[PDB]
């Protein structure tokens, strides 16, 4: 009856899955599948570029648009919730709208909103644009892995999906290289002037938007996954795509290129008035799929998969957010440690045309001597007085004056504002030709992370070959122990993250550990891909990735709620969870 | 007959080996084997901590222990000589005393004399105490490999003899981390009733001995390997041990012990004054051990023994590197980092000003105070050389990390300060008034190699990061088979371009250490697994310990010849 009807139904589902796998291994493995791998790797490169941007290059935005210190955590948190909701929504949509269609829509949204963020001024608009780029990038992996799976035979599935993390890593490397090239240096970016405004921040975002636009440009050529066509009652285009597959694979290598007759013979043998209605129907289909993800068939497998994904989330956070946060903190303490105090600049009426930086005066006194050529770069005076020391066309940078006076001294073209100069004595302290207005200070602490960007660049670049080694190596272990190796990797990652106290040592160790961590993530990704049915592969993958992102953003929330004094408690929680989940959460079919 | 008898013994060697490997294959695996692996790995943890101590920590700290100029460099060489003779002696002795007995006595020597070294004063006595500690610990790796391999089947040896490296590096990590935790800190050794204030590295040496104590306390449950019992010529105890381990391991899997226990009874049927007594025992055992070792150089094993000695020479420059080469560059990098971090302080004093600011790392030279007097001024890290201070009256001022040389004062009275004549070596005692002053016993050790304060941290991360590059390397060279050379070459080329890509800071040396120690020690494990399978158990431990002693000699002579050539 109904129960036996469903029994024969999923029996035929298994039969057709076997038949599709037979068709796939009949087509082969050649140029077409590697071209598709390169295109989906461009997509993963875009995803990695946005991950790097959000996790690494957030602290450079207070030089513009008046970014407050308390709202950086809010920006990161809301972008991670954007990635979460995007991953969940696009994963749910793909299995009832298309793997290529949803991937194209997500990449178009990401590219358009990244471009818009590159051309917005107010902080609110930039935050909104990054939030809506979050959904576009979060929708990538659940519709890249689960869409490249159906184009690969069983024997080559795990081996060739294990190499998709290399493109994520090279995307991180590309983003770091652009950051190092154009954010610090003023020779690569310049202000247009009257026609437009261009700081190194905008050019950085605009150039980081490029991998996404190339991915969407190259994604058009590849066709929709045949399995989706087969499941959605669409037969002719399935024949078309499979014919494209074997011909492209077999033109280079494969004797049957001469004639495909018998095999293709077997292949053919096998506006709210409607927009609102279709949106509601799509929502109903996605809700049905998500609810059936917790049915009697997958009541326990999905739960164990959740546990194994939670196992991984405490290394993804450490590599993506914890590492650059720690590097930034260490660079901050280093730049606080470095000092340059000038007691005075007394000279016998000799002009000083030389340029100096980091001038700080502590109780310095001037005997009413006029000095020409003084430079104010990274200058933070304290308890200092000036006597007729005015200079024409003086350049001001990082001017933070407090408890200091400038009696009978007038400066031109300075970044000083009313709020910058408070609680200090002043008489006739009026500055002419002042550049008052929107704060656009050059070298205004946005150039203070040059070493941070260089460290991130070389760390990721060196992770890349270690990642090559680890990815080439992990495929040797049997599939029953790749996730055990993942748990071991996470345990070692946490056992280090409980020990973070140095700069160069942390660079080297987190770099040589990025290889094993990233090579080990794809083992879990492959395990998630193979197990779930092709109808529910993308929902389940997106749902588990959404819980990985939820764990990451909850770690971010606690870390930003209590920072500095308490950092290692989440790592203790991580190690305890790893120990608890390595005992009985490895009985996965 | 003689010739017929020796021919029969040689031809029955294969039969007895087949019988014992069949017994091992039929006994089971999963509980006893893993508990044995854990206990013997915790015993190898002691060798790891000892080798780390002697390599990285021991040669530097000499000031508190009252060592001489040449002894400060000779200490490591002498400790390696002691570990040499210890490895040779215990490897030879383990083939006549037994498996567990020699391991127990070797770890007991390690524990007792490490404690005695932690509680000793005087350079010669400490030198001899660490010599005997090295003697005790040298024969800990050959005995552990032999005793552990006598409990595993022919195919199953690799997947445990490869993972003993896990505990070796766990020991390295523990020793390095614990050194980094204790060596800088001073309050871990708070004790009352004694005037002597020893440095905190005494507690470090004391806590390095705890792995040996834990191994001794855990080795009592594990019985001696039955293969030694069979080779000696006694059966009942061997059958006891075999049946007990089978009963212990029956819980893990399904083993039909009903008939398997029967054949272990008769497997041997086909496989055949008090101090004066102790002296006779000792001389007889020494002669028998010498003859047993001389049998290895006999033509029955000549070619393989010579090839093995050759590969032990070849596979030892990695040990030399990881022991002496990389610590030199690491400590030089740390020292130059500290030098760059500090700045020159020729003198910042100003007349008739409230110069109450605190200055760190006072390295003033020629900046004599011109009758400068200040009140409530704090001085830290005071180090003056031929500098005369006039009218410097400070009361209730605390100083630390102050060392003097060629120092002098003019009308300077110090109260509650750390200044003392202990650091006044080759310095004038002019105006050294110390009335109404707190005791100023200065610190030591850190004066020798001042840049080695957090070198233990970079060593700890090196030894820790060897692991993530260690499991992967072990699987790579354990599974692929005949493509190991190509895989290793590719990984080394990638690591070399990795190292060149590190052109930002002094992280390239840590990365090189980690990613080359991983491959080096994977290759070491390959060599060990190769050594254990070839030699028979009667001549296994003695041969492997002799090879280990030869490796120690290669390392010592290498450091000596590079000292002669370099510089
Ligand atoms: C986004 C949260 C972790 C992601 C999950 C996922 O699928 N990841 C891939 C990226 C190609 C990997 N590095 O294996 C890491
Ligand atoms: C660089 C030092 C190499 C050591 C020497 C040695 O004997 N090693 C074995 C035995 C546990 C290993 N870790 O496999 C590694």
Coordinates of C-alpha atoms and ligand atoms in Angstrom, one line a residue, chain A residues 44 47 51 83 141-142 145 161-162 164-169 309 312-313 316 320 467 517-523 525 541 545 548-549 552, ligand 1:
Chain A
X44 CA 35.4 29.0 -4.1
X47 CA 34.1 32.8 -1.3
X51 CA 36.0 35.3 4.0
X83 CA 26.6 34.3 5.6
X141 CA 30.0 26.0 -0.8
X142 CA 26.7 24.1 -0.3
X145 CA 30.5 20.9 -3.5
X161 CA 36.7 16.9 -4.4
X162 CA 39.6 16.9 -1.9
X164 CA 38.7 22.0 -4.0
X165 CA 40.2 23.6 -0.9
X166 CA 43.3 24.6 -2.8
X167 CA 41.1 27.2 -4.6
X168 CA 39.7 28.5 -1.3
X169 CA 43.3 28.9 -0.1
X309 CA 30.4 19.7 12.1
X312 CA 35.2 21.3 13.0
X313 CA 33.9 24.7 13.9
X316 CA 37.7 27.2 11.3
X320 CA 39.8 32.6 10.1
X467 CA 48.1 22.6 2.0
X517 CA 43.4 22.0 9.0
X518 CA 42.2 23.0 5.5
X519 CA 43.1 19.6 4.0
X520 CA 41.1 18.0 6.8
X521 CA 38.0 20.2 6.4
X522 CA 37.4 18.7 2.9
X523 CA 37.3 15.2 4.4
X525 CA 32.8 18.0 3.4
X541 CA 24.8 20.6 3.4
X545 CA 27.2 24.8 7.1
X548 CA 29.0 25.7 11.5
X549 CA 28.7 29.5 10.8
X552 CA 31.6 30.5 14.6
Ligands
LIG1 C1 32.4 28.0 5.9 C2 32.7 27.1 7.2 C3 33.8 26.1 7.0 C4 33.9 25.8 5.5 C5 33.0 24.6 5.2 C6 33.5 24.1 3.9 O1 32.9 23.5 3.1 N1 35.0 24.5 3.8 C7 35.9 24.3 2.6 C8 36.1 25.5 1.7 C9 36.3 25.1 0.3 C10 37.2 23.7 3.0 N2 38.4 24.5 3.3 O2 37.4 22.5 3.1 C11 35.3 25.3 5.0

